[PDB]
Amino acid sequence: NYAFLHATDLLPACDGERPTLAFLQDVMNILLQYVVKSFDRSTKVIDFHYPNELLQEYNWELADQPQNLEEILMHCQTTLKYAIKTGHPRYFNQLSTGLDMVGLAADWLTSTANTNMFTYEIAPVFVLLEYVTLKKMREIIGWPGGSGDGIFSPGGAISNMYAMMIARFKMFPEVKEKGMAALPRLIAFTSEHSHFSLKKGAAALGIGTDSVILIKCDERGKMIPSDLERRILEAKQKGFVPFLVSATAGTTVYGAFDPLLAVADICKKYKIWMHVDAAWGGGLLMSRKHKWKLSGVERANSVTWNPHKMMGVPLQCSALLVREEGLMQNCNQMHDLSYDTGDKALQCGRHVDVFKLWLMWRAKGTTGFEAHVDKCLELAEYLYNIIKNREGYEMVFDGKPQHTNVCFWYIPPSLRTLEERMSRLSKVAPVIKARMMEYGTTMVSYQPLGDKVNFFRMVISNPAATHQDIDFLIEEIERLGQD
Amino acid sequence: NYAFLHATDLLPACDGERPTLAFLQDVMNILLQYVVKSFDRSTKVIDFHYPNELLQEYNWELADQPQNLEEILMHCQTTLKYAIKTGHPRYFNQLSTGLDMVGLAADWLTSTANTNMFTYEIAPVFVLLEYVTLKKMREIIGWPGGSGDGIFSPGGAISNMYAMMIARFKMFPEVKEKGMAALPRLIAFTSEHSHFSLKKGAAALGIGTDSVILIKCDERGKMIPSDLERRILEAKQKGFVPFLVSATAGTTVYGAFDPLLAVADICKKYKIWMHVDAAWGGGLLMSRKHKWKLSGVERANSVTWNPHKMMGVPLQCSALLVREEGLMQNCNQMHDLSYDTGDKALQCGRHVDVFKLWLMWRAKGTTGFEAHVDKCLELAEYLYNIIKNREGYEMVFDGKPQHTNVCFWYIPPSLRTLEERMSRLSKVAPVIKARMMEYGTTMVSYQPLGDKVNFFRMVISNPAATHQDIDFLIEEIERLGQD
Numbered sequence: 021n022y023a024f025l026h027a028t029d030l031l032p033a034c035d036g037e038r039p040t041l042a043f044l045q046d047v048m049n050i051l052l053q054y055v056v057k058s059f060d061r062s063t064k065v066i067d068f069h070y071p072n073e074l075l076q077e078y079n080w081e082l083a084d085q086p087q088n089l090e091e092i093l094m095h096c097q098t099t100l101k102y103a104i105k106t107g108h109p110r111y112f113n114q115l116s117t118g119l120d121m122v123g124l125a126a127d128w129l130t131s132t133a134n135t136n137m138f139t140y141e142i143a144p145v146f147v148l149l150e151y152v153t154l155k156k157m158r159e160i161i162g163w164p165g166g167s168g169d170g171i172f173s174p175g176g177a178i179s180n181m182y183a184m185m186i187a188r189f190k191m192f193p194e195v196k197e198k199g200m201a202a203l204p205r206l207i208a209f210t211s212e213h214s215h216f217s218l219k220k221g222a223a224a225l226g227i228g229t230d231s232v233i234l235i236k237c238d239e240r241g242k243m244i245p246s247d248l249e250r251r252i253l254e255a256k257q258k259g260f261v262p263f264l265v266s267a268t269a270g271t272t273v274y275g276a277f278d279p280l281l282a283v284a285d286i287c288k289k290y291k292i293w294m295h296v297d298a299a300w301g302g303g304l305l306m307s308r309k310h311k312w313k314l315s316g317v318e319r320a321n322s323v324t325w326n327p328h329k330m331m332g333v334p335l336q337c338s339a340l341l342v343r344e345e346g347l348m349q350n351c352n353q354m355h356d357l358s359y360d361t362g363d364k365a366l367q368c369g370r371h372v373d374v375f376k377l378w379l380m381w382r383a384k385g386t387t388g389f390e391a392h393v394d395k396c397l398e399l400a401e402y403l404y405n406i407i408k409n410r411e412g413y414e415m416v417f418d419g420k421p422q423h424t425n426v427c428f429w430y431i432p433p434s435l436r437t438l439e440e441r442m443s444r445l446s447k448v449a450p451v452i453k454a455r456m457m458e459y460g461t462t463m464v465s466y467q468p469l470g471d472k473v474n475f476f477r478m479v480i481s482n483p484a485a486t487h488q489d490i491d492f493l494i495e496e497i498e499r500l501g502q503d
Numbered sequence: 504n505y506a507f508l509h510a511t512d513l514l515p516a517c518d519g520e521r522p523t524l525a526f527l528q529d530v531m532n533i534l535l536q537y538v539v540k541s542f543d544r545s546t547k548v549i550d551f552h553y554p555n556e557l558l559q560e561y562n563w564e565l566a567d568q569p570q571n572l573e574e575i576l577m578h579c580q581t582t583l584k585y586a587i588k589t590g591h592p593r594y595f596n597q598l599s600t601g602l603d604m605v606g607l608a609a610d611w612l613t614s615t616a617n618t619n620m621f622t623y624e625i626a627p628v629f630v631l632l633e634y635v636t637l638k639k640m641r642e643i644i645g646w647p648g649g650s651g652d653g654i655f656s657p658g659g660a661i662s663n664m665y666a667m668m669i670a671r672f673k674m675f676p677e678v679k680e681k682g683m684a685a686l687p688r689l690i691a692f693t694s695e696h697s698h699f700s701l702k703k704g705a706a707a708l709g710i711g712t713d714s715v716i717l718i719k720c721d722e723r724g725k726m727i728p729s730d731l732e733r734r735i736l737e738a739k740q741k742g743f744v745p746f747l748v749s750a751t752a753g754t755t756v757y758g759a760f761d762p763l764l765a766v767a768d769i770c771k772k773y774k775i776w777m778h779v780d781a782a783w784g785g786g787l788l789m790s791r792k793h794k795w796k797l798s799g800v801e802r803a804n805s806v807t808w809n810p811h812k813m814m815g816v817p818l819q820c821s822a823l824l825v826r827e828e829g830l831m832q833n834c835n836q837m838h839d840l841s842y843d844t845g846d847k848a849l850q851c852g853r854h855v856d857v858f859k860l861w862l863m864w865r866a867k868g869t870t871g872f873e874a875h876v877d878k879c880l881e882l883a884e885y886l887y888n889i890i891k892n893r894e895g896y897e898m899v900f901d902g903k904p905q906h907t908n909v910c911f912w913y914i915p916p917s918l919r920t921l922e923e924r925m926s927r928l929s930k931v932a933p934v935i936k937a938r939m940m941e942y943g944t945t946m947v948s949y950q951p952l953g954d955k956v957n958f959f960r961m962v963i964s965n966p967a968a969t970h971q972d973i974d975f976l977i978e979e980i981e982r983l984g985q986d
Contacts, residue, residue: 026866027604027605027863027866027867027871028867028871030604030605031538031539031542031604031967032542032590032592032966032967036542037539037542040538040539040604041535041539043604043608044535044538044604044607044608045531045535047608047611047612048528048531048611050612051611051612051615052524052527052528054615055514055523055527055615056514056520056523056524059514059515059519059520069627070839071623071627071630071631071839071842072839074627074628074631075631080628080631080632080635080861081635082635082636082639082861082864082865082869083865083868083869084868084869084870085868085870086866086867086868086870086871087865087866087868089866091865092605092862092865092866095862095865096608096609096612096862099612099616099628099858100612100615100616102627102628103616103618103627103628104616104618104625104626104627106616106617106618106625107515107617109515113624113625114619114625116619116852119615119617121510121513121514121523121526121527122510122513122575124527124614124615124617125526125527125530125579126579127614128530128531128534128611128614129530129533129534129579129582129583131607131610131611131614131817131818132534132537132538132583132602132607133582133583133586133587133589134589134590134602134607134817134818135586135587135589135818136597136599136818140554141596142587142589142596142597143587144552144554144557144585144586144587145557145563145582145585145586147554148554148557148558148563149563152563152564152565153565156565174657174658174661174850174854175657175850175851175852175853176851176852177849177850177851177852178657178849178850181849185707195706195709195711196706196711196712197706197711197712197713198711198713199683199705199709199710199711199713199714200682200683200684200709201683201684201686201688201711202711203684205684215851216837216851217851219837220835220837220849221849222682223678223679223680223837224668224707224708224849225707225708225709226678226682226683226708226709226710227682227709228678228679228680228681228682228684228685229679229680229837230680230681230682231682326852328852334614334617335614335617335618335619335852335854335855336852336854338852352703354699354702354703354706354712356553356554356555359554366660366661366664366703366704366707367657367658367660367661368658368659368660368698368699368700369599369658369659369660369809369811369818369819369821370658371657371818371819371854372818375582378563378565379575379578379579380510381565382565382566382570382574382575382578383509383510383569383570383572383575384510384511384569385566385567385568385569385570386565386566386567387567387568387569388510388511388569483515484514484515
């Protein structure tokens, strides 16, 4: 078979149908095996290699002449061998964790359809799903009858960038033709705990990171409303022009939620666009129990929401929602057609990301997403309640998690009663993490923040993570902490 | 089975392995069937429905309660039913056409791995493939030993946007902190035949579409070098600052190639960044026979290249290549680590697109891509030679295609000897196109350009398209043109 086959033998080659059905099914068998193992707790989360080791371990170089299909199937096998098992019960390293089965099936179909999003003409079903999916999301947000507008973007960082583009265009439509030189000095405001995409977006948009002012946060990670007003008032005293405040509904580290009702009030007072970065926190909008954390989002001019994070949609499902209909097109256009849409965004070519969200929503219902969001949040509560009362574990800030983010230090037995042992604590998480990966038992991110030294930022979003996996984690950290 | 199953029954559920293997395989069977039919010439390219018809034809709405897996498999079946068959031999509607079997297999695996690109830590193999794939592309471009830098972007439109960001940052690194208000008035230059992403990028970057000057093109679609110099000289006479010239290597309509050696010389003379938009034309760099069309690309500061177009990589494979190493990081950063990479681009989250290109390159070799690029170009020559000498067919410009783009009018027998029958010709392509879709036999794009009225822009990039399919097309157009 495959040893005497090549790509040129497969469809659209005439003697191609039989070898194609076999080859694709053999890839599928590899994929299925990896899928089941991903859920097996005896499987390593990571088979860790240094870049040079991985380079020397296998030939990854490219060649002039073609390789046979046996060698291609081996490449697939080898690739999944060294891949991180992002669906594994004990993978806790990023905000996006898990491997959703309907979502995967939906992604497989999307690739098979392999079309662009720009017109109804070539993506008729997908343009319609995009309209229905984004409308429902606008209802969940709280905009009356789901009114407003929306787009899927290639990342919430770009969704944030779009929101800033549109807030500027709204205040100064002439920027499009004339550039920033035509405008007064624009100022944007965001929290000290907010995502770096806002500074990056401003730099990209010719606004300048100097014109992105950071607002002070409290001990719990929440933007202080009175520092925001103070800063707005300073800006317009200097004759600068506030155009944007970006509030974060679920920060990346603490999982903190800015007080939306108070910033909404400040944005009402000063006539400023309110954006909500709900990339991470947006999932809690599916929870009747937890959505109160996003109270005031209904007053926002724009919202960013990443179903690829808490809702488990396979990678790249990010939406921007804008309340004022027509704005996005006006901003982005350069010159039944209502289904294009092409001149609403910066992208030209655009990958179909809607179907994976829509099929999952269909398979799970709104209630399904709800139940999952709550399962994760309780599990974080289970973690928080154990370590809160456990010797060797000190919380990074006082206040219960908002959110599945649990931030903590592990203090090894050889450091607890030491009479600036912070310097030694600073080095504990990096060593544990290193040992986690060498053994491949779990993965957790650690980082410093402000005046805090390297601490573990535990996060839960994987449906495969259970109470035992939290129990295992606590114990593994202890085991690996010597010293 | 599936009638009494739900998503909650599948992995990671404990009684989940058996129903998961069955469900995923049943989706796969649907996908395989659609794949084989895509190559069957008796299959319709499109089952055309108006948006309202499609909405009424099937319930696409979302619900609170979950649906069973039988209903989910039907959704998959229904979705592929109304999908355009972008792999079909007679699909000619866009620049991206075809369904590559290794590429599809590679895409299926990528989804299964479901990881982010931002660090070696979670995408160890994929970060390494990205380094090797982009280096080879830099060699093919002509940069010595493949020196330089590169990134995959979510579309060549964003790659174009990145190039403009970086050309600006290179001339005025202070823009990052201070914004466009700190700078002199920047001017960018591009051809009348160039892609709209350059104006869109400038508007986004706060540069202003007023500061994107369009350079005159000749009858064959190529930028006139002396209008470029004329325009550059006017800009600096007014004390404006030329920062960018974007030359197009393969325009979207004519498939024209700007004269790179002459613009390179102008960019050398005036000390201006040279970008090459080779999104479409980049494939010809794989052809020893055809690469001379891109002579001078080796002198470019940046190049955009979309393997998802002519090379047949499934949707979203776009690269930006930059000759000066370190520039991209310096531009994008806000503050063995060499494998991150995260602060090189605007995106945070980033989808893995490298593996589909790398596996295909492995399966085909450089020679494979070469042979395919030539197969398409000859087929376009076959089209051009038939219609050039065929009654009823008038070429849109004089000069042989550059390129698989063939631009033409069909003049129905009831218009040929008419003594301003252009007004009636203006309406022929829209009617034919409409009839093409109602019958579902083929799809071709038509458009006006400048002083030319609606003409067909035929394009070839699909490996499944043969001589018979061109023959069919000629005849179908004739059949449908009455009147």
